[PDB]
Amino acid sequence: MISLADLQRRIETGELSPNAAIAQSHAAIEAREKEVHAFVRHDKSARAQASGPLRGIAVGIKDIIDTANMPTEMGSEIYRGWQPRSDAPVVMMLKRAGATIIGKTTTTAFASRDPTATLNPHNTGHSPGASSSGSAAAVGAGMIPLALGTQTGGSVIRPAAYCGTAAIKPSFRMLPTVGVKCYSWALDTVGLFGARAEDLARGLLAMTGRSEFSGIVPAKAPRIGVVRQEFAGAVEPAAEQGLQAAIKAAERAGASVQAIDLPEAVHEAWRIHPIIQDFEAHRALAWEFSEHHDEIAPMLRASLDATVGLTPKEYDEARRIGRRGRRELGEVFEGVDVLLTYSAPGTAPAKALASTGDPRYNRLWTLMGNPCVNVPVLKVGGLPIGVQVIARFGNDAHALATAWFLEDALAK
């Protein structure tokens, strides 16, 4: 993988020129697209901008995110050739900072469960996850130093983990979802994919200009609360192996680690996530479902058909539960600075399974809204396994600092 922060530093000291950096990404992409298939379209003509902290940085944009110079096909045939008039605010955040939009990455149809043609860079016979398949795989395959994705269920943390890349789903609503094809407005959150926690920090810094993302440094003696989300069900061995390797590393590095069971309210919030997600999806995708029902990819079309009956009453009850969930989740952070849990059920499933991977270990957090960061830990049978770092809502900066601490801890 390519380091965003690395590029910046090298470019800043004349050691490396933006054009060279961009030419390198163009090369890398071409070097493996025939294998990875992470891009829906690659703008071979894209070039480095003249100024800005992100000048010379190539970025992939999940194809449910509006671009004015390239089509945004939503990973659906319904939007084949569709050309938005403007760039989504998040794309402009990157351009204004000097980034180069090198292409649109593959996304599942409307960012749901329907598998794309993208393959995991580590093992072609396995899925790159979903729905930001392209973005994760592209960064994982060392094609680009950064990529934008989105998470409603677990399409940022999971695929990053599956592809061994660092990634962050900032606190809910920090990054605007304007010009981002909506699945569930109460959940949809923009995310970033990079090589390490530091790269994600530099990315957010350039995009937002928020000082908390400036000069972030690895945390010291973090207070970690380990939650295994028993309510989400049985986890796969490889996933537990990584979590334990992470815990052991964090301890040697000086962290204080203690296991903790999340409150009943949180378990409940985890349960009703589908209700909130699916009820809104019917409203958010009303047009598609009503006028092009059959044109909707099979897996998405099925979950919608099965949930057309959800009522506003049970939807409201789900949101009450969600709120209690957030209320009591905050309490937990009175003792620890961050929570550590699984980033996925296990190693990325083989493409033959036609499964994009269960989001059960990701969904709760998208609903709670807290910033989540995936930390690559190890590989089993060649496929990556990571762990998820979660901080108090609005404390993205600390989540990244701790994730960073964790990265250094694992490197011994």
Place this chain on the structure above:
Amino acid sequence: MISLADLQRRIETGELSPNAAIAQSHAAIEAREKEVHAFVRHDKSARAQASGPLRGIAVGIKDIIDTANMPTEMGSEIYRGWQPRSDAPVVMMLKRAGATIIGKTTTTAFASRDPTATLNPHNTGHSPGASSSGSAAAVGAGMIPLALGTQTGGSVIRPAAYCGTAAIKPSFRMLPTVGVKCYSWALDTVGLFGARAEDLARGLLAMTGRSEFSGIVPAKAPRIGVVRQEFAGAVEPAAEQGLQAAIKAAERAGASVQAIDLPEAVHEAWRIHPIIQDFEAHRALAWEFSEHHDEIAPMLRASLDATVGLTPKEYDEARRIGRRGRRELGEVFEGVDVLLTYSAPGTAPAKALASTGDPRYNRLWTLMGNPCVNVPVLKVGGLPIGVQVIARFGNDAHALATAWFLEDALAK
């Protein structure tokens, strides 16, 4: 004006056919559109649907709200001919209820301050308000039974008052803002225009299927708390006159009315509405501001140019203050059922003033998120004057019931 609740009943018994109802609207629009200019586009072939609670109901759609069969030009040359791919979820809510989308109604450039060419239905020499001027003017001219607008500052309640029509800016986020050109995601709220409070109730019921809107009836002896929003300065005579008239009619109808103060926290929330709005605006209209600066309407271009320096720091501060206002505001609702205040500074400004009217008496409530309902009180110089009924967040049903109550009390 045309009553949706009225047409509904006549169509339900069989007295009126859906086709005849729609033929009615087409005629009403044809009869006054040339002098009022409320529609950007009138789909003359819009036909009635055979079923649904809104069959036979024609609706005007503010032109920053996506439609698949008609252009959505954001009231800006920048989007001339722009054709959205899908209908915004809210449009689909109406269509699924059996309604007829009869046209797109004029909007100010990106729903801001820049005046449109639409005229007030009560005097062609004044402003229909803004930015949902078209939607308000059309309902006010008796062209259509219902219309969708939006409010970031006061574009629903104010133009409603100016045009003398009932209207409601529902609880923040009840109606999705997907496919709704964003100005401020923390503020933007969809709203409805209709003849009377009952018509708004019926519309929301058909749109949301929420039981709270089913069976709504005039409130009895409501506990009303009067708030003059002193923090925004004094209002114009006509406005204060309408308020005094509203209070007398309420008291005479058996309602207990008491002057009340808003917590300093709330006053502060009003004061920082602009920071949250304009900061987010720079983010939501980044593309437009960067790529088409000079094509942006004068007034909007100036306000943006004047706020380019708003920082994330002062933005976060503003929000924290906004969150405190909401909390303490809810408290004010422990002793009273609804609040009564001004809907606008005064009667509609003369076209010569090139102003859409000050939103100062509407902006706070948009930030707080409470449901607000405009109730036409009287007329000064022929220009309508209304009052604003405000209930607790999530109590849209009560806000409509009290509004209905106030309507009856006024009719004496």
